[PDB]
Amino acid sequence: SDPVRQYLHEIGQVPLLTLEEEVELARKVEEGMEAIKKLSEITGLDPDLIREVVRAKILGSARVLDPKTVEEIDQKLKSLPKEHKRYLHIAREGEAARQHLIEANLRLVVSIAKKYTGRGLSFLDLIQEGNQGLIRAVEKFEYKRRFKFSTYATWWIRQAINRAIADQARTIRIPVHMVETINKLSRTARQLQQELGREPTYEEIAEAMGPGWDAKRVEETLKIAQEPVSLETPIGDEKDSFYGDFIPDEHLPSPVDAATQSLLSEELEKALSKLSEREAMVLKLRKGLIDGREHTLEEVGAFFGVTRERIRQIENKALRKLKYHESRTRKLRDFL
Amino acid sequence: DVPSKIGTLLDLSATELEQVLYFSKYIVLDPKGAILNGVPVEKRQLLTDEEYRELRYGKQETYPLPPGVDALVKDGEEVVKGQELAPGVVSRLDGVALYRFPRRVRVEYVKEPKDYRVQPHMNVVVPEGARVEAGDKIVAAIDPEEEVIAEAEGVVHLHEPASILVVKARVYPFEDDVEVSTGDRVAPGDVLADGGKVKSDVYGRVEVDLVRNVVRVVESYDIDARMGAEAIQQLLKELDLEALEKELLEEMKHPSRARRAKARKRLEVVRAFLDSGNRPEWMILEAVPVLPPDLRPMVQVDGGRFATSDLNDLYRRLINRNNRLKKLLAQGAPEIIIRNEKRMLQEAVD
DNA sequence: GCATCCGTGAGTAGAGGAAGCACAATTTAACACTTTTGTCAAG
DNA sequence: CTTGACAAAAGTGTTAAATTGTGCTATACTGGGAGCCGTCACGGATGC
């Protein structure tokens, strides 16, 4: 039932490494990485391609590039003479060592991840994001420096967890640099609050933040940092009323607005009948009543074969006739 | 939904279905000639985590020696269950004994038992009982200032191992290049090295030791057992509904009332699938539909605040976990990390 | 025969309700300049 | 209905400055934390 307890039971089956065990695996991984590079130089293949082929054999057939070419490339590696076959064995043992080194340090990420709960991600999500940092640390670790593994891996495990919080904890994503500004702004207001005995104003916050900050910038940053509210949140004690029941829809036109649009079109059509055949047709093209989009004076000219300036005077004349009829009927002013 | 439609078709209990779906037990899809506890393994058999590793990887255990004391067992000696390796601890299984980290190396020069102390940052490069010519490295080190080299020719002896590893395998000495590499799987009769001179006699995983220039085959099988909904989907695709219907009709003639009632309930689900034209494997999702955005809106209220529906947060969780699983698979992550991600993905869909 | 699991329980109305930093990639805004498009005066 | 204009509104590179995306940090650190009974009562269906 409990996924957290199942994971803790599984990682407890891998015993912690000793100092001698830790050093040997790190040396094998470092030597294994070096042997793959030489093989690519000798064989003329892509180093990233060789590592995948070596990694696939170690992991076995239980993992879903097509396998038809994996086995063919493996024959190429094995067809080298003994002088070159040693690099293949060193590469194989290195990848096996890398798998063992990762699995033995799964308790380290758990102890770190427990200090980041309550910040928008679940405990199992923090653990899986910290496991990615542990994988990166194995790649970059150097055992010549005589430092222990947990000294270096702790930097990479914390970074992965912290970055994942800044990228997944908000419905409306906020960039990493802006997230850091919001966190710094909250620390400052907390310190001033315990010093002034009351909530600070935006002018005190801006002065403590430093140069480049005024009260207007403080208010805009606080407005950005607001999280949306759920449509399904209840109000009251009884559970039959929710936020979404009080929010009108303002995108679809109302029945009243749909009817006045059609009433206006019908009255506009009857006015245009008083015009001539071309005077009305030119007016509709220019205003965009037929296709929905207006057409240039030249575009109307090309439709009828006439010049640009001809359209301007005939289009203007039709307007004068419409204004003259309009003043004698007052059937069109209410729609305005 | 009781009773489960998947469980009825596959003849699986409710508790057995939960153990496979949520990554708690394996199910066998291809035994590959594996024997467990002297009993051959059959299909549709549920394996625990300990059982699966024993079949797939083999038996081995490491016994930590107390500091200072010396092992009574030579390196590469076959031992038996109950045989005491150290004066304080005993072996719990039979197999080959191996030295892990010899703290002191003793060389018998030819002219002379000199003793060298080995640090955790130093590794021995020569095997036990090796005739090492003058100038050849005996113990390697990070800094050549502390490195130990051979003053004269002699035989190297290893002493004071940190721990003893006992593994059930077969050891094949060789002289020329080997035909296999670490991580390969072999069957009896397969060539190992020396152009067919050395051949394996048992199934197992092969690892090649370059210091001891021997080949070890850890006794294990290439068994096909899987967990999760991907294993359940495999079983549902192989069902022959016509063949299952004829078997259930024969059980319908049993004298027992209980047998006839159980066969009727299984037949009702089978009949529904045959007549409708649906496929049983469509009950496992491969692509998840997404609701249109206007039915799960994100709207700005009159005051400037935003309002959103719960479905958006449930979709975001699934997408985040789906993307992380892809990156973990491309990085060659270990099976413990991968299994955790897959269990989280199933729960996100639920 | 009994232990375990699962879905069901009237209607309308109201009225409150916690890291930094360095640096590379990418997006945006500013600014000119070229081209297109109306007006005006003829005619 | 057609020419010559005429400035204007709009379109088109060019570029510096905001803005955003990403990698990295070497003393040693290696299995969570909140719950916590007027626990609702009764019928139906399933599995022993």
Curated annotation (Swiss-Prot), chain B:
Signal peptide start-end: none
Subunit: The RNAP catalytic core consists of 2 alpha, 1 beta, 1 beta' and 1 omega subunit. When a sigma factor is associated with the core the holoenzyme is formed, which can initiate transcription.
Family: Belongs to the RNA polymerase beta' chain family.
Job description of the protein: DNA-dependent RNA polymerase catalyzes the transcription of DNA into RNA using the four ribonucleoside triphosphates as substrates.
Annotated protein name in UniProt: DNA-directed RNA polymerase subunit beta'
GN (gene name): rpoC
Positions spanned in the full protein: 107 to 579 of 1524
